[PDB]
Design an enzyme around this catalytic site. Structure first.
Site, PDB file in Angstrom:
ATOM      1  N   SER A 146       0.816  -1.224   0.000  1.00  0.00           N
ATOM      2  CA  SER A 146       0.000   0.000   0.000  1.00  0.00           C
ATOM      3  C   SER A 146       0.852   1.278   0.000  1.00  0.00           C
ATOM      4  O   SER A 146       1.618   1.512  -0.940  1.00  0.00           O
ATOM      5  CB  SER A 146      -0.992  -0.010   1.171  1.00  0.00           C
ATOM      6  OG  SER A 146      -2.094   0.836   0.907  1.00  0.00           O
ATOM      7  N   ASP A 201      -8.191  -4.699  -6.681  1.00  0.00           N
ATOM      8  CA  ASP A 201      -7.652  -3.862  -5.607  1.00  0.00           C
ATOM      9  C   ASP A 201      -7.839  -2.377  -5.933  1.00  0.00           C
ATOM     10  O   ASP A 201      -7.474  -1.922  -7.018  1.00  0.00           O
ATOM     11  CB  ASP A 201      -6.173  -4.185  -5.349  1.00  0.00           C
ATOM     12  CG  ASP A 201      -5.610  -3.457  -4.133  1.00  0.00           C
ATOM     13  OD1 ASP A 201      -6.340  -2.661  -3.511  1.00  0.00           O
ATOM     14  OD2 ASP A 201      -4.429  -3.675  -3.792  1.00  0.00           O
ATOM     15  N   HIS A 258      -7.518  -5.589  -1.501  1.00  0.00           N
ATOM     16  CA  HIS A 258      -6.280  -4.911  -1.100  1.00  0.00           C
ATOM     17  C   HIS A 258      -5.564  -5.587   0.037  1.00  0.00           C
ATOM     18  O   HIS A 258      -4.352  -5.414   0.206  1.00  0.00           O
ATOM     19  CB  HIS A 258      -6.593  -3.467  -0.717  1.00  0.00           C
ATOM     20  CG  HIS A 258      -5.378  -2.651  -0.349  1.00  0.00           C
ATOM     21  ND1 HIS A 258      -4.247  -2.669  -1.073  1.00  0.00           N
ATOM     22  CD2 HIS A 258      -5.157  -1.770   0.703  1.00  0.00           C
ATOM     23  CE1 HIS A 258      -3.342  -1.855  -0.509  1.00  0.00           C
ATOM     24  NE2 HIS A 258      -3.905  -1.297   0.574  1.00  0.00           N
TER      25      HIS A 258
END
Lengths: 269, 269
Positions: A146, A201, A258
């Site tokens: 991320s 995602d 994600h």
């Protein structure tokens, strides 16, 4: 499609990234053995892995993670953690570009991420270079999930060209800049950047290509679903700048996607 | 060490127990398809499964869950949700007993699970009795994870004896009464209790054997790790009231193992 060896590496750095989130690595001393809560990094635990330096909220933005020594795999791994709360971090995405002529001519880069490494570069570059000297036979890898991914990418392409290679493994990292910067990361030497994405995602979908942003080549895309195990027969190579049939497929994205890169990531049991 | 059909049933009611936490199930209109967020209940989404009754925070113990009509599997499922935070529930857990001779003579049980069920007993008895009337041939199955597991078990024991079998599938359930209530649950007629545990899960070891609490027999123990896929070979039948060699092992408990029952449970992505 992707080799067993490349699959193992993808799996291992997914856990180094997940390790940045889980268990005693938010703030720590030096020389500690790397362990995770809730089976979040078994392959790292299975190896002779040791901390070198651990950081938190470093610089102007909030930079958290660790520098690691892996005697088994022969690695020096800088792992950046993502955000404390991801859902919030998703909606606040400022779609502004800033020129990055220092790293490459004509390149434009996301103001939020580009300035994030620029505020911590010298403090961590030093400690990586130090580790290089002690184990100059060791592969320098920068990894992250991320926001930790975004950092690892900007930390990579930046600190490359100083005699040692920098491999980067990003898991669900967002777009960083323009077409020229997408073409740059593709052909820049002194390290191969591996941008790993999952199904739909929400992170690597953004910022949009309708904002002038772009993704580097190639893209490693996990087509297997959330909470589904991944095999090397479920990772398709998408070569070509912003080619379709990947995280760039015309449909509706998702957040739970994600949090699943090979295993559980960006959250802790 | 279990049959495949029993494996499929274990998996489905784990997903039914998971559903009680995750998705748009919390309070949706009747007849609407049962769905979950973050691949929490695919096998349930696969079936013609709709809500009959939706309930949340109802009762003196804030009892949460749903009644489910499964046309594909031909089941009527009552699913109990656990605590919103299992930590603030493990810490705040009171181990004081209370009389329960309505269910079985001599039995005493956990005052929390008993009173919470007692408050919703008649009301949920009624709505199951309607579904049994609507579908006489359908299998009535009470399920739950964690707290929900215990509630399901307390319900099963209670409502058995109205002319229809009630099968119970609990996942990482805590102990629920003394020696008398355990034996009753071990050999009771009109429905089988399937008590599922995983590795060194914490909750199934609470309350202590040394507080006037005992476990029903048999036990179905999951040996595979947290975040590891479960096969028929990873489940072992443990025979005996309070037997050892399964989850009842003299070792350090683990919270994450409670959050993995065939898939992600007790939490949502």
């Amino acid at each position: 499609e992707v080799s067993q060896d490349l699959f193992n590496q993808f799996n291992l750095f997914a856990q180094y990234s997940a390790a940045a989130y889980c268990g005693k690595n938010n703030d720590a001393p030096a020389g500690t053995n790397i362990t995770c809560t809730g089976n979040a990094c078994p392959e790292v635990e299975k190896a002779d892995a040791t901390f070198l330096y651990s950081f938190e909220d470093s610089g102007v933005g909030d930079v958290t993670g660790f520098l690691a020594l892996d005697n088994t795999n022969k690695l020096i791994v800088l792992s950046f953690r993502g955000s404390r709360s991801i859902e919030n971090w998703i909606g606040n995405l400022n779609f502004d570009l800033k020129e990055i002529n220092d790293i490459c001519s004509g390149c434009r880069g996301h103001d939020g991420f580009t300035s994030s490494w620029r505020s911590v570069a010298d403090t961590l570059r030093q400690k990586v270079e130090d580790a290089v000297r002690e184990h100059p036979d060791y592969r320098v890898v920068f990894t992250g999930h991320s926001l930790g991914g975004a950092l690892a990418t900007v930390a990579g392409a930046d600190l490359r060209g100083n005699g040692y290679d920098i491999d980067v493994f990003s898991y669900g990292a967002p777009r960083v800049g323009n077409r020229a910067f997408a073409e740059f990361l593709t052909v820049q030497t002194g390290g191969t950047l591996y941008r790993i994405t999952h199904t739909n995602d929400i992170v690597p979908r953004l910022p949009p290509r309708e904002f002038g942003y772009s993704h580097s080549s190639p893209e490693y895309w996990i087509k297997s679903g959330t909470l589904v195990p991944v095999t090397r027969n479920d990772i398709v190579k998408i070569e070509g700048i912003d080619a379709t049939g990947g995280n760039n497929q015309p449909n509706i994205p998702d957040i739970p996607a994600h949090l699943w890169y090979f295993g559980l990531i960006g959250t802790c049991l």
